[PDB]
Amino acid sequence: GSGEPREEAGALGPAWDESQLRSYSFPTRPIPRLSQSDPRAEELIENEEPVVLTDTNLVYPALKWDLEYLQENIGNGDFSVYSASTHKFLYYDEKKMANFQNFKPRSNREEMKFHEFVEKLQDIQQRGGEERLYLQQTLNDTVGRKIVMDFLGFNWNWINKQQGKRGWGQLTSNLLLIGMEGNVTPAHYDEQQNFFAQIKGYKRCILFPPDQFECLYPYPVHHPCDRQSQVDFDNPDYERFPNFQNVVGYETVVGPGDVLYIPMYWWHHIESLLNGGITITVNFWYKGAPTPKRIEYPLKAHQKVAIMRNIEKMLGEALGNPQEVGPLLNTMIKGRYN
Amino acid sequence: GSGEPREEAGALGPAWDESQLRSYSFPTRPIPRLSQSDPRAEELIENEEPVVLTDTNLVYPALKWDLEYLQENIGNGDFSVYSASTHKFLYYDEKKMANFQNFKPRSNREEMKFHEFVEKLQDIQQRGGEERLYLQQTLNDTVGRKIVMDFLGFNWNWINKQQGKRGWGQLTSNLLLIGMEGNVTPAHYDEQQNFFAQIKGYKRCILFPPDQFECLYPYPVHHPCDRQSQVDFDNPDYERFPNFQNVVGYETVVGPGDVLYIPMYWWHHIESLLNGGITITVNFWYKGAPTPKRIEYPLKAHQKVAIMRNIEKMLGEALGNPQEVGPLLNTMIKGRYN
Numbered sequence: 001g002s003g004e005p006r007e008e009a010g011a012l013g014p015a016w017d018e019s020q021l022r023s024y025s026f027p028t029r030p031i032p033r034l035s036q037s038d039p040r041a042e043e044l045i046e047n048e049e050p051v052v053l054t055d056t057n058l059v060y061p062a063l064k065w066d067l068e069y070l071q072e073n074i075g076n077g078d079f080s081v082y083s084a085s086t087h088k089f090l091y092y093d094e095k096k097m098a099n100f101q102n103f104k105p106r107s108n109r110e111e112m113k114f115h116e117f118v119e120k121l122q123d124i125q126q127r128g129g130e131e132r133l134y135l136q137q138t139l140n141d142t143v144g145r146k147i148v149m150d151f152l153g154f155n156w157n158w159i160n161k162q163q164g165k166r167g168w169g170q171l172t173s174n175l176l177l178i179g180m181e182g183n184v185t186p187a188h189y190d191e192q193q194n195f196f197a198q199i200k201g202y203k204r205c206i207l208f209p210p211d212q213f214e215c216l217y218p219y220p221v222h223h224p225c226d227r228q229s230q231v232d233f234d235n236p237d238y239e240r241f242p243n244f245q246n247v248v249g250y251e252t253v254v255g256p257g258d259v260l261y262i263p264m265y266w267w268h269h270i271e272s273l274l275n276g277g278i279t280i281t282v283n284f285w286y287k288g289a290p291t292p293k294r295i296e297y298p299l300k301a302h303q304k305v306a307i308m309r310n311i312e313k314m315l316g317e318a319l320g321n322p323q324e325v326g327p328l329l330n331t332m333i334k335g336r337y338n
Numbered sequence: 339g340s341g342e343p344r345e346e347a348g349a350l351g352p353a354w355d356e357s358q359l360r361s362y363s364f365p366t367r368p369i370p371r372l373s374q375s376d377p378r379a380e381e382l383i384e385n386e387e388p389v390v391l392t393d394t395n396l397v398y399p400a401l402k403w404d405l406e407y408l409q410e411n412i413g414n415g416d417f418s419v420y421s422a423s424t425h426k427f428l429y430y431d432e433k434k435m436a437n438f439q440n441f442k443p444r445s446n447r448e449e450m451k452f453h454e455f456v457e458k459l460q461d462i463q464q465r466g467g468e469e470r471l472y473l474q475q476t477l478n479d480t481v482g483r484k485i486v487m488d489f490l491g492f493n494w495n496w497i498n499k500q501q502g503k504r505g506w507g508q509l510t511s512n513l514l515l516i517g518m519e520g521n522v523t524p525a526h527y528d529e530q531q532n533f534f535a536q537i538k539g540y541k542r543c544i545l546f547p548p549d550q551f552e553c554l555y556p557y558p559v560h561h562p563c564d565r566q567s568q569v570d571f572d573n574p575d576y577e578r579f580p581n582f583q584n585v586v587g588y589e590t591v592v593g594p595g596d597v598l599y600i601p602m603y604w605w606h607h608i609e610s611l612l613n614g615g616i617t618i619t620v621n622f623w624y625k626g627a628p629t630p631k632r633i634e635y636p637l638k639a640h641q642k643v644a645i646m647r648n649i650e651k652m653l654g655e656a657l658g659n660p661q662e663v664g665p666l667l668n669t670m671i672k673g674r675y676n
């Protein structure tokens with residue numbers, strides 16, 4: 001798993017204990033925790049494998065952040081706040097909701113000012129209700145001057161060197177994440193390189209390499225939950241998803257000051273620790289390096305995932321209806337390739 | 339089936355009787371036999387449905403053909419002669435034999451002069467052996483002057499009008515077919531429009547429309563038997579090919595002077611009648627009409643077959659190995675589209 005819980009400086013006790021981790025059916029092994037000066041960390045990022053960097057100082061000015069400080073300085077912009085009846089915040093593409101009419105969302109999005117989100121959070125704690133909120137908002141110009149000064153204080157020297165040494169594309173987005181304890185972002189994979197900068201609280205990160213595509217059963221590309229696993233990690237249906245019994249993850253717990261490299265196309269299941277308070281995270285997303293001119297074989301697992309995605313996209317446009325993608329694929333292989 | 343056997347002119351008896359037809363497990367209904375002046379025959383060809391035209395005079399000068407006449411006038415060119423231990427002449431692409439090493443051919447091709455094929459045929463009848471031969475050769479310049487005169491005597495006025503009225507491409511090939519009684523060309527589909535001009539003997543033609551792709555289970559596109567059905571019509575494996583229990587064919591018996599329009603992508607199973615002597619056929623293959631600019635929906639069945647073919651071709655080149663096409667397709671749909 002995450003190994004033994006780390007001891008905090010000043011003898012302040014264990015940062016967490018195992019009772020704050022949710023229980024699942026699959027084994028894991030630890031993601032390495034290394035210094036940014038460690039060459040092994042450099043070779044992991046280069047080979048697109050996850051690593052937790054403990055001393056980047058990437059978001060050092062943001063480590064003082066909390067709700068009180070942010071509400072006063074984050075400005076009067078709008079923030080996307082997702083609500084959920086349960087602890088699972090399954091994301092859904094609103095653009096693709098037209099393809100699947102028999103899909104009703106379980107986590108409705110709502111725009112609100114930051115002071116409204118802080119107010120709405122404190123009502124749930126007062127009322128003792130079980131409703132959960134998760135702020136997920138991209139940062140921009142509307143933020144106040146002090147947040148701008150903190151942002152400029154980020155270790156741009158280090159992360160821009162990482163961008164150059166890997167040949168990545170440009171920085172596409174900065175996502176601010178503020179979640180309640182026990183909030184779970186279920187397993188999914190992204191298409192860009194991610195630097196996961198933990199700020200407040202602790203998050204358990206369970207990653208799965210791209211070659212376990214067969215064990216995680218993502219939704220159809222045209223489904224609103226595209227790129228997310230169909231498997232309910234809390235109650236896996238081994239009849240529908242038999243190879244989930246073969247899944248093995250990479251696990252770590254990140255805390256304030258840690259940066260987790262989530263490589264492009266790697267599955268990740270992220271949860272804020274139980275009874276751990278609020279969590280704050282800022283992501284750095286970079287387009288991957290361009291596909292090289294001389295195609296080398298055998299193909300990497302994420303390249304085959306890209307191929308499978310393009311086949312499904314091409315079929316949807318070719319047939320004139322994404323719902324015919326399924327039956328044509330079955331017609332193509334039944335009694336011919338299985 | 340083929341309906342009642344036709345009575346020949348001059349009270350020469352029935353052209354054939356049902357005992358000369360092989361028995362299969364599927365029902366059929368008759369392909370229409372019409373005059374070329376019948377508008378219904380014109381609308382069948384236009385809508386790409388099979389029809390037997392009884393009075394085209396397409397190969398009228400060739401109706402006098404037999405082994406003796408051809409051997410004397412066909413010239414000293416080489417002829418492709420396929421041999422088979424059984425009555426099934428399953429064709430195999432020699433170019434694709436590299437992809438599947440565990441494939442050994444059952445019908446070896448051999449080049450020989452026409453007088454050698456006639457000699458080799460008469461030895462089998464003398465020795466009483468059960469070996470079977472099937473001459474399948476494209477016609478060209480090397481043929482003698484009298485065969486040239488017969489060829490020029492074909493009803494080019496009619497068939498070139500059909501080429502124009504359908505917007506077909508150019509005439510790509512003329513295949514001369516000389517087979518022994520009981521010879522079976524198992525079920526397969528071609529990609530071009532075919533005018534099937536019967537000359538000597540009788541052939542039972544069983545056709546299946548493109549929308550029965552699911553019932554006929556063709557080989558993988560990269561397999562040497564690409565475009566041929568995997569189902570043994572003589573012993574169908576309902577466990578591997580369950581939807582073959584749903585197959586329904588279009589059936590007719592063509593004789594001297596009949597022309598069968600086999601539409602592009604239609605499956606066809608062709609057999610020379612049992613105890614019917616030798617059969618002679620000449621095919622006319624035309625590239626189909628170009629795909630129209632404004633794509634209309636829903637797609638025709640043969641267009642979806644074209645899509646499935648291109649997906650398999652694209653995967654073979656993308657993965658660098660046609661043998662990885664299967665497992666990737668299974669990975670793509672297992673637990674996601676089935």
Ligand SMILES: O=C(O)Cc1cs/c(=N\C(=O)CS(=O)(=O)Cc2ccc3ccccc3c2)n1O
Nearest residue numbers: 091136172173177185190191192268270281285
């Ligand atoms: O709670 C947690 O900490 C876990 C968690 C909460 S959100 C989340 N990821 C996303 O939101 C990203 S994505 O899924 O929309 C897909 C995507 C991928 C690259 C992009 C790059 C730029 C802009 C947008 C992008 C979007 N993770 O991993």
Ligand SMILES: O=C(O)Cc1cs/c(=N\C(=O)CS(=O)(=O)Cc2ccc3ccccc3c2)n1O
Nearest residue numbers: 429474510511515523528529530606608619623
């Ligand atoms: O015994 C019988 O009468 C039944 C029978 C014996 S042969 C046969 N068909 C073929 O040979 C053709 S094909 O399979 O190679 C595929 C193809 C398709 C279009 C073409 C056009 C031009 C040149 C070559 C072509 C090749 N049929 O239907």
Ligand SMILES: [Zn+2]
Nearest residue numbers: 188189190268
């Ligand atoms: Zn993500």
Ligand SMILES: [Zn+2]
Nearest residue numbers: 526527528606
């Ligand atoms: Zn054919």
